[PDB]
Amino acid sequence: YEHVTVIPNTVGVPYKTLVNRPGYSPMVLEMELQSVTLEPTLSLDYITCEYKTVIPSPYVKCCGTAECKDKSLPDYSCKVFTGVYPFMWGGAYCFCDAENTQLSEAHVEKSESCKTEFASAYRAHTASASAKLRVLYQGNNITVAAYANGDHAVTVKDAKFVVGPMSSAWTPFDNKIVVYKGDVYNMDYPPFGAGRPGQFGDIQSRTPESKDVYANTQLVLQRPAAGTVHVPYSQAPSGFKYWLKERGASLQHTAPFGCQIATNPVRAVNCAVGNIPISIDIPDAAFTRVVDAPSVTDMSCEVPACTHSSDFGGVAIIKYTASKKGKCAVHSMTNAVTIREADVEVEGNSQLQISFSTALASAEFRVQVCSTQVHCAAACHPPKDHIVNYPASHTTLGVQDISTTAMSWVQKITGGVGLIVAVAALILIVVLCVSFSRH
Amino acid sequence: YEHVTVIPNTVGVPYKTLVNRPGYSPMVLEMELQSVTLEPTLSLDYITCEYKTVIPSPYVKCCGTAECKDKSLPDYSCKVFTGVYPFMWGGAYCFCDAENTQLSEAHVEKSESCKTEFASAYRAHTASASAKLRVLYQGNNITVAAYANGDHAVTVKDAKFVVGPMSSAWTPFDNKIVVYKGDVYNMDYPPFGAGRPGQFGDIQSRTPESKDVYANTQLVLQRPAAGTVHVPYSQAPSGFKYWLKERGASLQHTAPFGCQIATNPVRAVNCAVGNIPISIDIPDAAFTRVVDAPSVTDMSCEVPACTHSSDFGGVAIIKYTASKKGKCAVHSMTNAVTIREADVEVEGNSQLQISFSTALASAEFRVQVCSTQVHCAAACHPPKDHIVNYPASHTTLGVQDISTTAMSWVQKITGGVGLIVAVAALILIVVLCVSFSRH
Amino acid sequence: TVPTEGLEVTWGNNEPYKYWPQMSTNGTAHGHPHEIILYYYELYPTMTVVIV
Numbered sequence: 001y002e003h004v005t006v007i008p009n010t011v012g013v014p015y016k017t018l019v020n021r022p023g024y025s026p027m028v029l030e031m032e033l034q035s036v037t038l039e040p041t042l043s044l045d046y047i048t049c050e051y052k053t054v055i056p057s058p059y060v061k062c063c064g065t066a067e068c069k070d071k072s073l074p075d076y077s078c079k080v081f082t083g084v085y086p087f088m089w090g091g092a093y094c095f096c097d098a099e100n101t102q103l104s105e106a107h108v109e110k111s112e113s114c115k116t117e118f119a120s121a122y123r124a125h126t127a128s129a130s131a132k133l134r135v136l137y138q139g140n141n142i143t144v145a146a147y148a149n150g151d152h153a154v155t156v157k158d159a160k161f162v163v164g165p166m167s168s169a170w171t172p173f174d175n176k177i178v179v180y181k182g183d184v185y186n187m188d189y190p191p192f193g194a195g196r197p198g199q200f201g202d203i204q205s206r207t208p209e210s211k212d213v214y215a216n217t218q219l220v221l222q223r224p225a226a227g228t229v230h231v232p233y234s235q236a237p238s239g240f241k242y243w244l245k246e247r248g249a250s251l252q253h254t255a256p257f258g259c260q261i262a263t264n265p266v267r268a269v270n271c272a273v274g275n276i277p278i279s280i281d282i283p284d285a286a287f288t289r290v291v292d293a294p295s296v297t298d299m300s301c302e303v304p305a306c307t308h309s310s311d312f313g314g315v316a317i318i319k320y321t322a323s324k325k326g327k328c329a330v331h332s333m334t335n336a337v338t339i340r341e342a343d344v345e346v347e348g349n350s351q352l353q354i355s356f357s358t359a360l361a362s363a364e365f366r367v368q369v370c371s372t373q374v375h376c377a378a379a380c381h382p383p384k385d386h387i388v389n390y391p392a393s394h395t396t397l398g399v400q401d402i403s404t405t406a407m408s409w410v411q412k413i414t415g416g417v418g419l420i421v422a423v424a425a426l427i428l429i430v431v432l433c434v435s436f437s438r439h
Numbered sequence: 440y441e442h443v444t445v446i447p448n449t450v451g452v453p454y455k456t457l458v459n460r461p462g463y464s465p466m467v468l469e470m471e472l473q474s475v476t477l478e479p480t481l482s483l484d485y486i487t488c489e490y491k492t493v494i495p496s497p498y499v500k501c502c503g504t505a506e507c508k509d510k511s512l513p514d515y516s517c518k519v520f521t522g523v524y525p526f527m528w529g530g531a532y533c534f535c536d537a538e539n540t541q542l543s544e545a546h547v548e549k550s551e552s553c554k555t556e557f558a559s560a561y562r563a564h565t566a567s568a569s570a571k572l573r574v575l576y577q578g579n580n581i582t583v584a585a586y587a588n589g590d591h592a593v594t595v596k597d598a599k600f601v602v603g604p605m606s607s608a609w610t611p612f613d614n615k616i617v618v619y620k621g622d623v624y625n626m627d628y629p630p631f632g633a634g635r636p637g638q639f640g641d642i643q644s645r646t647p648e649s650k651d652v653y654a655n656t657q658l659v660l661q662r663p664a665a666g667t668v669h670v671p672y673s674q675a676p677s678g679f680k681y682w683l684k685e686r687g688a689s690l691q692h693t694a695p696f697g698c699q700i701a702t703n704p705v706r707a708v709n710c711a712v713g714n715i716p717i718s719i720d721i722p723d724a725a726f727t728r729v730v731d732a733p734s735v736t737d738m739s740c741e742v743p744a745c746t747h748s749s750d751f752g753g754v755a756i757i758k759y760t761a762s763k764k765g766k767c768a769v770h771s772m773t774n775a776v777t778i779r780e781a782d783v784e785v786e787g788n789s790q791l792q793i794s795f796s797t798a799l800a801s802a803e804f805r806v807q808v809c810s811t812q813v814h815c816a817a818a819c820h821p822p823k824d825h826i827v828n829y830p831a832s833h834t835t836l837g838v839q840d841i842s843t844t845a846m847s848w849v850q851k852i853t854g855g856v857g858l859i860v861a862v863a864a865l866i867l868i869v870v871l872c873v874s875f876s877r878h
Numbered sequence: 879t880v881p882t883e884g885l886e887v888t889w890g891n892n893e894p895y896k897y898w899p900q901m902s903t904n905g906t907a908h909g910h911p912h913e914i915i916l917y918y919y920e921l922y923p924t925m926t927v928v929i930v
């Protein structure tokens with residue numbers, strides 16, 4: 001026996017549905033949603049980290065001319081200077097007082113610390129979905145876990161469940177993201193091989209264990225000062241350090257719809273969009289025949305108090321006459337009023353108590369208890385607190401919902417004005433016929 | 440200097456482009472495409488293999504009644520029979536001739552061979568692309584390799600190349616594919632947990648190392664024959680074996696556009712769709728000044744033979760007078776004619792020879808050699824071979840390409856008819872003017 | 879039949895073959911009028927009839 005329902009995508013509010021099968025007593029179910037998760041598909045592009053500079057000892061050749069050759073190492077440079085005359089702690093270095101030369105060189109490498117401090121760039125694709133549910137079944141709580149599409153089914157206590165697919169495809173991630181120790185940012189990083197001297201991406205590599213390194217920093221050698229031995233240079237500062245000090249707020253604080261974000265692996269949790277269909281299959285062994293359920297013959301309704309607050313602010317008292325002891329289900333027959341209790345116990349001649357919530361100013365609704373109907377009505381008062389810390393447990397109201405007192409005034413006014421038009425219309429018709437016929 | 444070009448997606452056909460920079464001699468490049476590869480992103484759903492049935496020894500109890508309890512094993516069954524009287528090789532088993540019973544049970548497991556013979560179901564997503572090229576650069580062959588999108592750049596001999604993106608998003612794979620030892624099929628496999636008794640998907644598991652198995656084969660126990668000890672049963676035969684005997688043709692033999700298929704990893708190669716843009720950055724040191732290149736002052740052209748076949752069926756001879764020894768480029772000024780040679784060497788007073796191919800019935804075109812132009816013309820004959828084994832090396836024709844003799848006949852007929860209208864109209868204009876004036 | 883885009887044929891366990899068509903005709907593009915029409919008809923049958 002198949003049954004289909006739809007529940008909105010809100011976490012932490014229960015919902016109820018009615019199953020009615022001819023020949024058997026009605027049964028009422030309750031469901032509550034605990035978590036929804038989305039997970040994208042990722043591919044890696046490159047990583048960045050700090051750099052290091054290597055400078056070997058200078059070569060000083062007096063009374064001679066030096067020269068240097070080219071190499072393939074990244075950012076290699078060599079220069080030759082003339083007219084030097086170094087000093088050391090014991091006196092002058094070389095006997096010659098002229099025609100001295102000095103040779104200098106430097107190149108750029110990758111830092112060792114890159115295995116622990118680094119950032120990674122990714123490409124994003126279509127995401128999957130998963131969900132977790134709590135179901136009240138046969139007087140006990142059971143839990144199910146399944147993928148949110150039509151390609152998965154689970155069996156708990158001889159019942160089949162199918163969840164999904166979802167009604168919306170909205171995702172908070174763009175095409176390009178960058179990840180760093182729990183934070184996710186949206187950023188359009190520069191392409192491979194097209195870095196800049198002082199921004200994100202001056203140094204690039206394909207994986208932390210690769211040996212190929214690309215670098216686009218500036219490196220210019222400068223003339224040494226008189227009487228000293230050293231190798232001065234000019235170079236742009238590191239771009240990875242600057243980003244850490246100016247990166248701003250992450251997605252967890254700016255994302256819409258109230259989503260949460262975790263990074264191992266990258267996930268989005270509890271985004272409230274859309275609704276989810278659900279399908280359930282119930283075996284025949286769970287039903288009870290109508291001949292065995294008790295009957296109820298007389299009913300009445302009395303309501304002592306009503307305040308239309310966000311919580312359960314209603315109370316009702318119902319009287320009954322029952323044939324024999326047993327169980328019965330309770331259900332509301334209107335949409336504006338929700339009832340908390342699902343099952344009640346009945347015996348002999350007694351009364352039962354129920355509670356409800358509603359946003360209507362004037363209440364009128366029907367209650368079904370084991371195949372009978374009862375009518376209740378009341379007037380409700382407004383609350384006194386301005387702000388609460390939880391969402392409402394009832395639906396919104398429409399344009400047709402108006403108090404009984406207000407409706408009466410509208411009827412009298414419209415009726416009165418309509419009569420004046422009606423009486424005046426008849427006089428015109430009588431006169432018009434006389435003119436027509438008499439001529 | 441930045442240059443942009445567009446190349447059609449055809450393998451095995453060379454193409455040429457012209458680079459023109461004011462103040463310098465022109466340069467000609469040649470490019471040829473060797474391979475293009477597409478690769479999708481995959482995700483595993485479940486696997487299937489063959490099954491085994493386990494039957495423990497029966498239990499025979501004489502002069503009594505037996506019973507059995509429930510268990511959680513897949514496809515478990517138990518039954519009890521009465522009225523049995525088994526025999527063995529030495530005589531009857533038990534003394535009692537009545538009130539005996541027999542108990543039998545069986546269940547289903549996963550075969551050991553699943554580690555070697557299995558099939559796997561995948562779900563596919565958007566694919567990436569890559570390409571490899573050959574370029575003729577300053578008299579040498581160089582090779583490049585890059586991804587077919589705008590996010591990659593490579594440098595070879597101080598030249599920077601960027602390739603992509605592609606003009607089309609066509610892919611030969613659907614959302615659901617099946618892989619088995621080098622073959623790929625398009626198939627809509629059943630949902631997990633919803634198998635069928637005699638088709639693909641009766642046995643399901645999540646990984647070859649998992650312990651959870653779902654089974655939906657039929658198993659019914661039957662009555663033993665008189666005088667024998669055994670456990671007969673009825674069951675539907677394996678669905679995996681059936682699929683192997685009637686699976687049909689693979690994706691390689693049925694796919695369109697001539698694509699080829701490989702499986703480790705899954706790829707598709709050499710699909711002829713769309714076109715690919717290319718951008719190149721040439722350094723300043725590669726150019727030669729106009730004052731250093733030789734000059735050519737006098738030219739004439741003659742064409743001794745032409746046959747408009749799919750190969751290079753033309754020959755041409757050009758006479759020239761040069762100012763000094765040097766090198767020169769050759770490039771065609773029309774789209775319907777292609778010239779194989781890229782450059783020539785010029786000296787003194789001599790002649791040079793070239794070859795060309797075209798689809799025109801009557802050939803007229805211009806040839807440029809080091810900033811001067813010459814006019815050539817000839818007539819062409821049709822070939823005799825009906826079928827060949829290689830594609831054409833020239834472009835298609837339009838409505839404007841018509842033999843010179845055919846155009847002449849069109850002009851005489853159209854002009855002659857038009858004159859008769861022209862003379863007739865003049866008579867009409869005169870007669871009306873006379874009639875207007877006479878009145 | 880061999881279409882414009884080509885044909886591929888496989889036989890047993892061997893490698894496939896490839897074929898492409900090539901222009902041929904019994905007419906001529908120079909000479910008398912009735913021989914000019916035949917030349918184009920055998921290459922583009924459908925457009926020749928519509929235009930004429």
Ligand SMILES: *[C@@H]1O[C@H](CO)[C@@H](O)[C@H](O)[C@H]1NC(C)=O
Pocket residue numbers: 115116
């Ligand atoms: C811990 O250190 C290892 C390398 O020693 C690194 O791979 C990993 O990312 C680090 N984890 C955290 C949370 O810092």
Ligand SMILES: *[C@@H]1O[C@H](CO)[C@@H](O)[C@H](O)[C@H]1NC(C)=O
Pocket residue numbers: 139140141
């Ligand atoms: C579990 O079932 C009991 C009834 O037996 C119910 O009162 C309780 O609320 C259920 N658990 C939760 C978390 O609602």
Ligand SMILES: *[C@@H]1O[C@H](CO)[C@@H](O)[C@H](O)[C@H]1NC(C)=O
Pocket residue numbers: 554555
């Ligand atoms: C080779 O054997 C291993 C296990 O022994 C299996 O995983 C693999 O699929 C086999 N390959 C082929 C081509 O049969």
Ligand SMILES: *[C@@H]1O[C@H](CO)[C@@H](O)[C@H](O)[C@H]1NC(C)=O
Pocket residue numbers: 578579580
């Ligand atoms: C390499 O260059 C030569 C010209 O020097 C050319 O003939 C040859 O075809 C090129 N190689 C390939 C594989 O095309």
Ligand SMILES: *[C@@H]1O[C@H](CO)[C@@H](O)[C@H](O)[C@H]1NC(C)=O
Pocket residue numbers: 902903904920
């Ligand atoms: C042309 O004439 C020859 C004469 O032998 C004939 O075989 C052929 O079918 C004709 N048509 C073509 C298109 O060659």
